[PDB]
Amino acid sequence: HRNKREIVKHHAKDVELQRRVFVDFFCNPERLRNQVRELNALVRARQASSS
Amino acid sequence: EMQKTWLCKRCETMNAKLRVLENVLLLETYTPDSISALHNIRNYLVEATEEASAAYNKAVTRLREYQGVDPHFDTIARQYHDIVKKLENMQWTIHQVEMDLKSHD
Amino acid sequence: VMAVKEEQYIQQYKKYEMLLNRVGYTPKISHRELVEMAEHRKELDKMTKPVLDTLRSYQDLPPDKALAALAIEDKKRQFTAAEKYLEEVLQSALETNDE
Amino acid sequence: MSSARLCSLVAELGYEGAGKLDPDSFEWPFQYDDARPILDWICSSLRPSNVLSLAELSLYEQFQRIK
Amino acid sequence: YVRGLLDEWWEQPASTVVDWVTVDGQSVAAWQNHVKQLLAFYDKESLRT
Amino acid sequence: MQSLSSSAPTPEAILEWLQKEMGYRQLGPYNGSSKSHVPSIDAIRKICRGNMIPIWNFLINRVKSEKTVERIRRNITV
Protein backbone atom coordinates (compact mmCIF):
# COMPACT_ATOMS: atom_id res chain seq x y z
CA HIS A 1 0.00 0.00 0.00
CA ARG A 2 3.04 2.27 0.29
CA ASN A 3 3.64 1.61 -3.43
CA LYS A 4 0.28 0.30 -4.69
CA ARG A 5 -1.41 3.52 -3.59
CA GLU A 6 1.60 5.61 -4.66
CA ILE A 7 1.79 3.99 -8.11
CA VAL A 8 -1.58 5.65 -8.71
CA LYS A 9 0.21 8.98 -8.28
CA HIS A 10 2.97 7.73 -10.58
CA HIS A 11 0.70 7.03 -13.54
CA ALA A 12 -0.53 10.63 -13.37
CA LYS A 13 2.78 11.24 -15.18
CA ASP A 14 3.84 7.70 -16.16
CA VAL A 15 1.09 7.34 -18.78
CA GLU A 16 2.23 10.81 -19.90
CA LEU A 17 6.03 10.55 -20.18
CA GLN A 18 6.10 7.60 -22.58
CA ARG A 19 3.02 9.01 -24.33
CA ARG A 20 4.77 12.34 -24.97
CA VAL A 21 8.13 10.89 -26.03
CA PHE A 22 6.95 8.55 -28.79
CA VAL A 23 3.18 8.05 -28.72
CA ASP A 24 2.40 11.73 -29.34
CA PHE A 25 4.55 11.57 -32.48
CA PHE A 26 1.62 9.74 -34.12
CA CYS A 27 -1.16 10.88 -31.76
CA ASN A 28 -0.90 14.69 -31.84
CA PRO A 29 -2.60 14.84 -35.27
CA GLU A 30 -5.00 12.21 -33.92
CA ARG A 31 -5.89 14.30 -30.85
CA LEU A 32 -7.80 16.73 -33.09
CA ARG A 33 -10.32 13.92 -33.57
CA ASN A 34 -9.22 12.29 -30.28
CA GLN A 35 -9.92 15.31 -28.06
CA VAL A 36 -12.67 13.29 -26.32
CA ARG A 37 -12.15 9.60 -27.17
CA GLU A 38 -8.46 9.54 -26.16
CA LEU A 39 -9.25 7.64 -22.94
CA ASN A 40 -9.39 4.47 -25.06
CA ALA A 41 -5.92 5.42 -26.31
CA LEU A 42 -5.02 5.78 -22.61
CA VAL A 43 -6.05 2.30 -21.42
CA ARG A 44 -2.88 0.66 -22.76
CA ALA A 45 -0.72 2.64 -20.30
CA ARG A 46 -2.88 3.10 -17.18
CA GLN A 47 -3.52 -0.60 -16.49
CA ALA A 48 0.21 -1.34 -16.83
CA SER A 49 0.77 0.94 -13.83
CA SER A 50 -1.78 -1.12 -11.87
CA SER A 51 1.01 -3.62 -11.16
CA GLU B 1 0.16 -22.54 31.98
CA MET B 2 0.04 -19.29 29.99
CA GLN B 3 -1.47 -20.85 26.86
CA LYS B 4 -4.88 -20.84 28.53
CA THR B 5 -4.33 -17.06 28.82
CA TRP B 6 -2.17 -15.84 25.91
CA LEU B 7 -2.45 -18.72 23.47
CA CYS B 8 -6.15 -18.29 24.31
CA LYS B 9 -6.27 -14.49 24.34
CA ARG B 10 -6.88 -15.12 20.63
CA CYS B 11 -9.74 -17.47 21.49
CA GLU B 12 -11.68 -14.20 21.72
CA THR B 13 -10.10 -12.88 18.50
CA MET B 14 -10.38 -15.75 16.01
CA ASN B 15 -14.05 -15.73 16.99
CA ALA B 16 -14.20 -12.05 16.02
CA LYS B 17 -11.70 -11.68 13.16
CA LEU B 18 -13.24 -14.60 11.27
CA ARG B 19 -16.79 -13.37 11.90
CA VAL B 20 -16.50 -9.64 11.17
CA LEU B 21 -15.27 -9.93 7.57
CA GLU B 22 -18.04 -12.40 6.67
CA ASN B 23 -20.76 -9.74 6.33
CA VAL B 24 -18.82 -7.67 3.78
CA LEU B 25 -19.08 -9.07 0.25
CA LEU B 26 -22.89 -9.25 0.16
CA LEU B 27 -23.26 -5.48 0.50
CA GLU B 28 -20.36 -4.87 -1.91
CA THR B 29 -22.02 -6.99 -4.62
CA TYR B 30 -24.76 -4.37 -5.10
CA THR B 31 -22.99 -1.00 -4.94
CA PRO B 32 -22.30 -0.73 -8.72
CA ASP B 33 -26.00 -1.32 -9.41
CA SER B 34 -27.09 0.73 -6.37
CA ILE B 35 -26.72 3.93 -8.43
CA SER B 36 -30.06 3.29 -10.14
CA ALA B 37 -31.63 2.64 -6.73
CA LEU B 38 -30.26 5.99 -5.50
CA HIS B 39 -29.75 8.23 -8.56
CA ASN B 40 -33.40 7.55 -9.43
CA ILE B 41 -35.22 8.63 -6.26
CA ARG B 42 -37.80 10.49 -8.32
CA ASN B 43 -36.62 8.63 -11.44
CA TYR B 44 -38.07 5.30 -10.32
CA LEU B 45 -39.63 5.13 -13.77
CA VAL B 46 -39.89 1.43 -13.18
CA GLU B 47 -43.36 2.97 -13.02
CA ALA B 48 -42.92 3.93 -16.69
CA THR B 49 -42.57 0.21 -17.35
CA GLU B 50 -46.26 0.00 -16.48
CA GLU B 51 -46.88 3.41 -18.04
CA ALA B 52 -45.37 1.76 -21.13
CA SER B 53 -46.81 -1.70 -20.43
CA ALA B 54 -49.33 -1.05 -23.24
CA ALA B 55 -47.03 -3.14 -25.43
CA TYR B 56 -49.16 -6.14 -24.39
CA ASN B 57 -52.75 -5.41 -25.43
CA LYS B 58 -51.74 -4.64 -29.02
CA ALA B 59 -51.54 -8.41 -29.48
CA VAL B 60 -55.20 -8.04 -30.45
CA THR B 61 -54.01 -5.66 -33.17
CA ARG B 62 -51.68 -8.48 -34.28
CA LEU B 63 -54.71 -10.68 -35.00
CA ARG B 64 -55.86 -8.06 -37.54
CA GLU B 65 -52.51 -6.59 -38.65
CA TYR B 66 -51.85 -8.68 -41.77
CA GLN B 67 -55.48 -8.33 -42.93
CA GLY B 68 -54.53 -5.24 -44.93
CA VAL B 69 -53.48 -7.60 -47.72
CA ASP B 70 -57.10 -8.69 -48.20
CA PRO B 71 -58.55 -5.38 -49.52
CA HIS B 72 -55.78 -5.25 -52.14
CA PHE B 73 -56.16 -8.88 -53.14
CA ASP B 74 -54.81 -8.33 -56.66
CA THR B 75 -51.46 -7.23 -55.21
CA ILE B 76 -50.46 -10.74 -54.10
CA ALA B 77 -51.77 -12.05 -57.42
CA ARG B 78 -48.49 -10.92 -59.00
CA GLN B 79 -46.64 -11.42 -55.68
CA TYR B 80 -47.80 -14.93 -54.74
CA HIS B 81 -44.35 -15.80 -53.34
CA ASP B 82 -44.36 -13.39 -50.38
CA ILE B 83 -47.35 -14.98 -48.61
CA VAL B 84 -45.25 -18.06 -47.82
CA LYS B 85 -43.02 -16.01 -45.52
CA LYS B 86 -46.12 -14.38 -44.00
CA LEU B 87 -47.41 -17.79 -42.85
CA GLU B 88 -45.16 -18.01 -39.78
CA ASN B 89 -46.36 -14.60 -38.52
CA MET B 90 -50.15 -15.02 -38.25
CA GLN B 91 -50.12 -17.19 -35.10
CA TRP B 92 -47.35 -15.38 -33.20
CA THR B 93 -49.90 -13.18 -31.40
CA ILE B 94 -51.03 -16.20 -29.36
CA HIS B 95 -47.59 -16.57 -27.78
CA GLN B 96 -46.77 -12.88 -28.24
CA VAL B 97 -49.03 -12.42 -25.19
CA GLU B 98 -46.40 -14.02 -22.97
CA MET B 99 -43.72 -11.75 -24.43
CA ASP B 100 -45.43 -8.44 -25.24
CA LEU B 101 -46.39 -8.14 -21.59
CA LYS B 102 -43.02 -9.58 -20.61
CA SER B 103 -41.94 -6.58 -22.68
CA HIS B 104 -42.96 -4.86 -19.43
CA ASP B 105 -43.23 -7.80 -16.99
CA VAL C 1 7.03 -8.71 14.39
CA MET C 2 3.96 -8.07 16.58
CA ALA C 3 5.16 -4.60 17.62
CA VAL C 4 3.19 -2.88 14.83
CA LYS C 5 1.74 -5.62 12.58
CA GLU C 6 -0.90 -6.31 15.25
CA GLU C 7 -2.68 -3.19 13.93
CA GLN C 8 -4.50 -5.20 11.26
CA TYR C 9 -4.99 -7.89 13.93
CA ILE C 10 -6.58 -5.43 16.39
CA GLN C 11 -8.59 -3.63 13.68
CA GLN C 12 -10.90 -6.66 13.37
CA TYR C 13 -12.99 -5.42 16.33
CA LYS C 14 -14.05 -1.97 15.08
CA LYS C 15 -15.85 -3.72 12.19
CA TYR C 16 -18.15 -5.79 14.44
CA GLU C 17 -21.26 -3.77 13.50
CA MET C 18 -20.79 -4.97 9.90
CA LEU C 19 -23.40 -7.76 10.37
CA LEU C 20 -25.87 -5.39 8.60
CA ASN C 21 -24.96 -6.91 5.16
CA ARG C 22 -28.44 -8.46 4.86
CA VAL C 23 -29.47 -5.04 3.47
CA GLY C 24 -27.75 -6.16 0.26
CA TYR C 25 -31.15 -7.16 -1.12
CA THR C 26 -32.39 -3.59 -0.54
CA PRO C 27 -30.69 -2.24 -3.70
CA LYS C 28 -31.42 -5.58 -5.38
CA ILE C 29 -35.01 -4.91 -4.32
CA SER C 30 -34.90 -1.69 -6.36
CA HIS C 31 -32.07 -1.66 -8.90
CA ARG C 32 -33.19 -4.99 -10.34
CA GLU C 33 -36.48 -3.29 -11.16
CA LEU C 34 -34.41 -0.35 -12.39
CA VAL C 35 -32.42 -2.70 -14.62
CA GLU C 36 -35.69 -4.49 -15.34
CA MET C 37 -36.40 -1.29 -17.27
CA ALA C 38 -33.26 -2.25 -19.16
CA GLU C 39 -34.48 -5.87 -19.13
CA HIS C 40 -37.73 -4.62 -20.66
CA ARG C 41 -35.86 -3.05 -23.59
CA LYS C 42 -34.45 -6.43 -24.60
CA GLU C 43 -37.98 -7.73 -24.08
CA LEU C 44 -39.04 -4.73 -26.15
CA ASP C 45 -36.38 -5.95 -28.59
CA LYS C 46 -38.15 -9.33 -28.49
CA MET C 47 -40.97 -7.67 -30.45
CA THR C 48 -38.99 -8.22 -33.65
CA LYS C 49 -37.29 -11.54 -32.86
CA PRO C 50 -40.20 -13.39 -34.54
CA VAL C 51 -40.80 -10.36 -36.76
CA LEU C 52 -37.21 -10.27 -38.05
CA ASP C 53 -38.45 -12.88 -40.52
CA THR C 54 -41.54 -10.71 -41.09
CA LEU C 55 -39.35 -7.81 -42.23
CA ARG C 56 -38.42 -10.25 -45.00
CA SER C 57 -42.12 -10.22 -45.89
CA TYR C 58 -42.43 -6.54 -44.97
CA GLN C 59 -39.61 -5.80 -47.42
CA ASP C 60 -41.79 -7.15 -50.25
CA LEU C 61 -44.81 -4.98 -49.36
CA PRO C 62 -43.79 -1.45 -50.53
CA PRO C 63 -42.67 -2.73 -53.96
CA ASP C 64 -46.08 -4.40 -54.39
CA LYS C 65 -48.42 -3.04 -51.69
CA ALA C 66 -47.12 0.51 -51.98
CA LEU C 67 -50.33 2.13 -50.75
CA ALA C 68 -50.89 -0.67 -48.23
CA ALA C 69 -47.35 -0.13 -46.91
CA LEU C 70 -48.82 2.70 -44.79
CA ALA C 71 -51.47 0.46 -43.19
CA ILE C 72 -49.62 -2.81 -42.39
CA GLU C 73 -45.97 -1.83 -41.83
CA ASP C 74 -46.55 0.67 -39.01
CA LYS C 75 -49.23 -1.68 -37.63
CA LYS C 76 -46.37 -3.93 -36.51
CA ARG C 77 -44.79 -0.85 -34.93
CA GLN C 78 -48.05 -0.25 -33.05
CA PHE C 79 -47.08 -2.75 -30.34
CA THR C 80 -43.55 -1.33 -30.32
CA ALA C 81 -44.83 2.26 -30.21
CA ALA C 82 -47.28 1.20 -27.48
CA GLU C 83 -44.41 1.86 -25.05
CA LYS C 84 -42.37 4.68 -26.63
CA TYR C 85 -44.52 7.46 -25.17
CA LEU C 86 -43.15 6.58 -21.71
CA GLU C 87 -39.94 4.90 -22.90
CA GLU C 88 -37.82 8.06 -22.74
CA VAL C 89 -38.22 8.28 -18.97
CA LEU C 90 -37.66 4.52 -18.85
CA GLN C 91 -34.34 5.16 -20.59
CA SER C 92 -33.77 8.03 -18.14
CA ALA C 93 -33.31 5.52 -15.30
CA LEU C 94 -32.20 2.27 -16.94
CA GLU C 95 -29.23 4.32 -18.16
CA THR C 96 -28.08 4.25 -14.54
CA ASN C 97 -28.31 0.47 -15.09
CA ASP C 98 -26.93 0.46 -18.66
CA GLU C 99 -25.19 3.74 -19.55
CA MET D 1 -39.89 -7.38 6.08
CA SER D 2 -43.41 -8.51 5.19
CA SER D 3 -44.54 -4.95 5.99
CA ALA D 4 -42.69 -3.94 2.82
CA ARG D 5 -45.38 -5.87 0.95
CA LEU D 6 -47.92 -3.98 3.06
CA CYS D 7 -46.58 -0.77 1.52
CA SER D 8 -47.03 -2.51 -1.83
CA LEU D 9 -50.79 -2.44 -1.14
CA VAL D 10 -50.44 1.35 -1.59
CA ALA D 11 -49.98 0.63 -5.30
CA GLU D 12 -53.61 0.92 -6.37
CA LEU D 13 -53.82 3.63 -3.69
CA GLY D 14 -50.91 5.34 -5.40
CA TYR D 15 -51.98 8.93 -4.75
CA GLU D 16 -51.46 8.21 -1.03
CA GLY D 17 -48.05 6.61 -1.63
CA ALA D 18 -46.43 9.77 -2.97
CA GLY D 19 -44.28 9.94 0.15
CA LYS D 20 -43.30 6.31 -0.50
CA LEU D 21 -41.22 7.28 -3.54
CA ASP D 22 -37.72 7.20 -2.03
CA PRO D 23 -38.43 3.95 -0.06
CA ASP D 24 -38.79 2.25 -3.44
CA SER D 25 -35.14 1.36 -2.79
CA PHE D 26 -35.11 1.29 1.03
CA GLU D 27 -37.74 -1.44 1.19
CA TRP D 28 -36.25 -3.69 3.86
CA PRO D 29 -36.50 -0.85 6.47
CA PHE D 30 -40.25 -0.38 5.84
CA GLN D 31 -40.75 -1.53 9.46
CA TYR D 32 -39.74 1.89 10.79
CA ASP D 33 -41.56 3.59 7.91
CA ASP D 34 -44.73 2.13 9.47
CA ALA D 35 -43.52 2.70 13.04
CA ARG D 36 -46.68 4.57 14.08
CA PRO D 37 -49.11 1.65 13.45
CA ILE D 38 -46.70 -0.77 15.18
CA LEU D 39 -48.02 0.04 18.66
CA ASP D 40 -51.56 -0.76 17.44
CA TRP D 41 -50.71 -3.88 15.38
CA ILE D 42 -47.72 -5.35 17.22
CA CYS D 43 -49.71 -8.51 17.98
CA SER D 44 -50.28 -9.21 14.29
CA SER D 45 -46.67 -8.29 13.45
CA LEU D 46 -44.90 -10.07 16.32
CA ARG D 47 -44.95 -13.52 14.69
CA PRO D 48 -43.45 -12.69 11.23
CA SER D 49 -40.56 -10.57 12.49
CA ASN D 50 -39.68 -13.09 15.23
CA VAL D 51 -39.02 -16.13 13.03
CA LEU D 52 -37.53 -13.92 10.31
CA SER D 53 -34.96 -12.68 12.82
CA LEU D 54 -34.50 -16.21 14.21
CA ALA D 55 -32.93 -17.34 10.91
CA GLU D 56 -29.83 -15.26 11.60
CA LEU D 57 -30.19 -15.78 15.36
CA SER D 58 -30.25 -19.58 14.99
CA LEU D 59 -26.49 -19.57 14.32
CA TYR D 60 -25.88 -18.72 18.00
CA GLU D 61 -28.13 -21.47 19.40
CA GLN D 62 -25.45 -24.16 19.09
CA PHE D 63 -22.97 -22.04 21.10
CA GLN D 64 -24.25 -23.76 24.26
CA ARG D 65 -22.89 -27.11 23.05
CA ILE D 66 8.31 -59.36 26.56
CA LYS D 67 11.30 -58.76 28.84
CA TYR E 1 -22.58 -15.49 5.26
CA VAL E 2 -19.79 -17.28 3.40
CA ARG E 3 -19.55 -14.34 0.98
CA GLY E 4 -17.05 -12.51 3.18
CA LEU E 5 -14.85 -15.55 3.85
CA LEU E 6 -12.23 -14.23 1.42
CA ASP E 7 -12.42 -10.84 3.16
CA GLU E 8 -10.78 -12.36 6.24
CA TRP E 9 -8.07 -13.57 3.86
CA TRP E 10 -8.14 -9.95 2.67
CA GLU E 11 -6.73 -8.92 6.07
CA GLN E 12 -3.34 -10.59 6.58
CA PRO E 13 -2.94 -11.80 2.95
CA ALA E 14 -4.11 -8.41 1.70
CA SER E 15 -2.32 -8.31 -1.65
CA THR E 16 -5.77 -8.15 -3.26
CA VAL E 17 -6.84 -5.20 -1.09
CA VAL E 18 -3.91 -3.11 -2.31
CA ASP E 19 -4.31 -4.60 -5.80
CA TRP E 20 -7.65 -2.95 -6.60
CA VAL E 21 -6.64 0.53 -5.39
CA THR E 22 -5.87 1.11 -9.09
CA VAL E 23 -9.03 -0.28 -10.73
CA ASP E 24 -11.12 2.37 -8.98
CA GLY E 25 -8.39 4.74 -10.09
CA GLN E 26 -8.89 3.13 -13.49
CA SER E 27 -12.62 3.69 -12.94
CA VAL E 28 -11.80 7.42 -12.82
CA ALA E 29 -9.41 7.25 -15.79
CA ALA E 30 -12.07 9.21 -17.66
CA TRP E 31 -11.63 11.84 -14.94
CA GLN E 32 -7.88 11.39 -15.49
CA ASN E 33 -8.36 12.61 -19.07
CA HIS E 34 -8.19 16.10 -17.57
CA VAL E 35 -4.92 15.04 -15.96
CA LYS E 36 -4.10 13.71 -19.42
CA GLN E 37 -5.24 17.10 -20.77
CA LEU E 38 -2.63 19.14 -18.87
CA LEU E 39 0.17 17.43 -20.81
CA ALA E 40 -1.21 15.52 -23.81
CA PHE E 41 -3.66 18.22 -24.89
CA TYR E 42 -0.82 20.72 -24.52
CA ASP E 43 0.71 18.89 -27.49
CA LYS E 44 -2.53 19.53 -29.39
CA GLU E 45 -1.57 23.21 -29.56
CA SER E 46 1.86 22.18 -30.86
CA LEU E 47 0.35 21.54 -34.30
CA ARG E 48 -2.79 23.65 -33.79
CA THR E 49 -0.63 26.73 -33.14
CA MET F 1 -44.50 0.36 -5.82
CA GLN F 2 -45.96 3.73 -4.86
CA SER F 3 -45.90 7.45 -5.77
CA LEU F 4 -46.43 8.00 -9.50
CA SER F 5 -48.03 4.56 -9.44
CA SER F 6 -51.84 4.56 -9.67
CA SER F 7 -51.96 7.62 -11.95
CA ALA F 8 -49.85 7.00 -15.07
CA PRO F 9 -48.93 3.27 -14.81
CA THR F 10 -52.28 1.82 -13.69
CA PRO F 11 -55.07 3.18 -15.93
CA GLU F 12 -53.58 3.27 -19.43
CA ALA F 13 -52.43 -0.35 -18.95
CA ILE F 14 -55.44 -1.88 -17.19
CA LEU F 15 -55.36 -4.65 -19.80
CA GLU F 16 -51.54 -4.57 -19.75
CA TRP F 17 -50.10 -3.73 -16.32
CA LEU F 18 -52.30 -5.63 -13.90
CA GLN F 19 -52.42 -8.95 -15.78
CA LYS F 20 -48.89 -9.11 -17.22
CA GLU F 21 -47.71 -10.73 -13.98
CA MET F 22 -49.23 -14.11 -14.89
CA GLY F 23 -49.50 -13.56 -18.65
CA TYR F 24 -46.83 -16.23 -19.02
CA ARG F 25 -48.56 -18.32 -16.34
CA GLN F 26 -52.04 -18.38 -17.91
CA LEU F 27 -51.07 -18.28 -21.61
CA GLY F 28 -50.87 -22.05 -22.01
CA PRO F 29 -53.52 -23.38 -19.63
CA TYR F 30 -56.06 -20.57 -19.30
CA ASN F 31 -55.53 -17.93 -22.03
CA GLY F 32 -56.07 -20.51 -24.78
CA SER F 33 -59.38 -22.17 -23.94
CA SER F 34 -61.38 -19.42 -25.65
CA LYS F 35 -61.19 -19.06 -29.42
CA SER F 36 -60.11 -15.41 -29.08
CA HIS F 37 -56.87 -16.02 -27.19
CA VAL F 38 -55.74 -12.43 -26.57
CA PRO F 39 -59.25 -10.85 -26.34
CA SER F 40 -60.30 -13.41 -23.73
CA ILE F 41 -57.40 -12.25 -21.55
CA ASP F 42 -59.20 -8.90 -21.41
CA ALA F 43 -61.92 -10.78 -19.53
CA ILE F 44 -59.26 -12.97 -17.90
CA ARG F 45 -57.70 -9.66 -16.84
CA LYS F 46 -60.56 -9.53 -14.32
CA ILE F 47 -60.13 -13.10 -13.06
CA CYS F 48 -56.34 -12.72 -12.86
CA ARG F 49 -56.93 -10.95 -9.53
CA GLY F 50 -58.55 -13.99 -7.93
CA ASN F 51 -55.72 -16.41 -8.67
CA MET F 52 -53.02 -13.92 -7.62
CA ILE F 53 -53.47 -10.79 -5.46
CA PRO F 54 -50.12 -9.54 -4.17
CA ILE F 55 -47.83 -8.75 -7.12
CA TRP F 56 -50.57 -6.49 -8.49
CA ASN F 57 -49.63 -4.31 -5.52
CA PHE F 58 -45.98 -4.34 -6.59
CA LEU F 59 -46.80 -1.60 -9.06
CA ILE F 60 -43.87 0.60 -10.04
CA ASN F 61 -40.97 -1.56 -8.89
CA ARG F 62 -41.62 -5.29 -8.86
CA VAL F 63 -44.97 -6.01 -10.49
CA LYS F 64 -42.81 -7.54 -13.25
CA SER F 65 -43.28 -11.00 -11.77
CA GLU F 66 -42.48 -12.78 -15.06
CA LYS F 67 -38.84 -11.96 -14.27
CA THR F 68 -39.26 -10.72 -10.67
CA VAL F 69 -40.59 -14.10 -9.48
CA GLU F 70 -37.40 -14.74 -7.51
CA ARG F 71 -37.68 -11.17 -6.16
CA ILE F 72 -41.42 -10.76 -5.49
CA ARG F 73 -41.32 -13.65 -3.01
CA ARG F 74 -37.99 -12.76 -1.39
CA ASN F 75 -39.45 -9.36 -0.44
CA ILE F 76 -41.45 -11.27 2.19
CA THR F 77 -38.37 -12.22 4.23
CA VAL F 78 -35.06 -11.41 2.51
Side-chain angles (χ1 to χ4, degrees), chain B residues 14 26 34 37 57 64 90 103:
Chain B
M14 311 285 158
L26 178 54
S34 66
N57 66 323
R64 282 87 172 183
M90 293 274 208
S103 178

PDB file of all heavy atoms in Angstrom, chain B residues 14 26 34 37 57 64 90 103:
ATOM      1  N   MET B  14      -9.996 -14.936  17.159  1.00  0.00           N
ATOM      2  CA  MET B  14     -10.378 -15.753  16.009  1.00  0.00           C
ATOM      3  C   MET B  14     -11.890 -15.898  15.908  1.00  0.00           C
ATOM      4  O   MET B  14     -12.420 -16.099  14.809  1.00  0.00           O
ATOM      5  CB  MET B  14      -9.720 -17.131  16.082  1.00  0.00           C
ATOM      6  CG  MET B  14      -8.229 -17.108  16.360  1.00  0.00           C
ATOM      7  SD  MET B  14      -7.288 -16.600  14.909  1.00  0.00           S
ATOM      8  CE  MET B  14      -5.775 -16.025  15.670  1.00  0.00           C
ATOM      9  N   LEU B  26     -21.495  -9.312   0.585  1.00  0.00           N
ATOM     10  CA  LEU B  26     -22.890  -9.250   0.157  1.00  0.00           C
ATOM     11  C   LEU B  26     -23.320  -7.815  -0.126  1.00  0.00           C
ATOM     12  O   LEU B  26     -23.978  -7.541  -1.135  1.00  0.00           O
ATOM     13  CB  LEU B  26     -23.792  -9.884   1.215  1.00  0.00           C
ATOM     14  CG  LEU B  26     -25.297  -9.862   0.935  1.00  0.00           C
ATOM     15  CD1 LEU B  26     -25.603 -10.479  -0.421  1.00  0.00           C
ATOM     16  CD2 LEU B  26     -26.058 -10.581   2.039  1.00  0.00           C
ATOM     17  N   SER B  34     -26.344  -0.097  -7.305  1.00  0.00           N
ATOM     18  CA  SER B  34     -27.094   0.731  -6.368  1.00  0.00           C
ATOM     19  C   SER B  34     -27.283   2.160  -6.858  1.00  0.00           C
ATOM     20  O   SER B  34     -28.091   2.890  -6.273  1.00  0.00           O
ATOM     21  CB  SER B  34     -26.399   0.752  -5.006  1.00  0.00           C
ATOM     22  OG  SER B  34     -25.142   1.399  -5.087  1.00  0.00           O
ATOM     23  N   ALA B  37     -30.755   2.603  -7.895  1.00  0.00           N
ATOM     24  CA  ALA B  37     -31.632   2.640  -6.733  1.00  0.00           C
ATOM     25  C   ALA B  37     -31.513   3.944  -5.956  1.00  0.00           C
ATOM     26  O   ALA B  37     -32.373   4.227  -5.115  1.00  0.00           O
ATOM     27  CB  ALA B  37     -31.334   1.458  -5.808  1.00  0.00           C
ATOM     28  N   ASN B  57     -51.387  -5.267 -24.909  1.00  0.00           N
ATOM     29  CA  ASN B  57     -52.746  -5.407 -25.426  1.00  0.00           C
ATOM     30  C   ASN B  57     -52.823  -5.249 -26.934  1.00  0.00           C
ATOM     31  O   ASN B  57     -53.840  -5.622 -27.529  1.00  0.00           O
ATOM     32  CB  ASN B  57     -53.682  -4.397 -24.759  1.00  0.00           C
ATOM     33  CG  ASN B  57     -53.348  -2.966 -25.116  1.00  0.00           C
ATOM     34  OD1 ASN B  57     -52.181  -2.604 -25.243  1.00  0.00           O
ATOM     35  ND2 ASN B  57     -54.375  -2.142 -25.279  1.00  0.00           N
ATOM     36  N   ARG B  64     -55.297  -8.746 -36.382  1.00  0.00           N
ATOM     37  CA  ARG B  64     -55.855  -8.061 -37.542  1.00  0.00           C
ATOM     38  C   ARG B  64     -54.837  -7.139 -38.205  1.00  0.00           C
ATOM     39  O   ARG B  64     -55.220  -6.146 -38.832  1.00  0.00           O
ATOM     40  CB  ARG B  64     -57.107  -7.276 -37.143  1.00  0.00           C
ATOM     41  CG  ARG B  64     -58.352  -8.137 -36.969  1.00  0.00           C
ATOM     42  CD  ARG B  64     -58.439  -8.696 -35.555  1.00  0.00           C
ATOM     43  NE  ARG B  64     -59.707  -9.369 -35.298  1.00  0.00           N
ATOM     44  CZ  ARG B  64     -60.055  -9.885 -34.127  1.00  0.00           C
ATOM     45  NH1 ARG B  64     -59.254  -9.819 -33.076  1.00  0.00           N
ATOM     46  NH2 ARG B  64     -61.238 -10.482 -34.006  1.00  0.00           N
ATOM     47  N   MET B  90     -48.742 -15.210 -38.592  1.00  0.00           N
ATOM     48  CA  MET B  90     -50.147 -15.018 -38.246  1.00  0.00           C
ATOM     49  C   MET B  90     -50.445 -15.484 -36.825  1.00  0.00           C
ATOM     50  O   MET B  90     -51.246 -14.861 -36.118  1.00  0.00           O
ATOM     51  CB  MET B  90     -51.037 -15.752 -39.248  1.00  0.00           C
ATOM     52  CG  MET B  90     -50.998 -15.176 -40.653  1.00  0.00           C
ATOM     53  SD  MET B  90     -52.170 -13.826 -40.884  1.00  0.00           S
ATOM     54  CE  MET B  90     -52.506 -13.968 -42.638  1.00  0.00           C
ATOM     55  N   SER B 103     -42.517  -7.852 -22.253  1.00  0.00           N
ATOM     56  CA  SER B 103     -41.945  -6.581 -22.677  1.00  0.00           C
ATOM     57  C   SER B 103     -42.000  -5.542 -21.569  1.00  0.00           C
ATOM     58  O   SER B 103     -41.197  -4.604 -21.568  1.00  0.00           O
ATOM     59  CB  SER B 103     -42.680  -6.074 -23.918  1.00  0.00           C
ATOM     60  OG  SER B 103     -42.185  -4.817 -24.336  1.00  0.00           O
TER      61      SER B 103
END
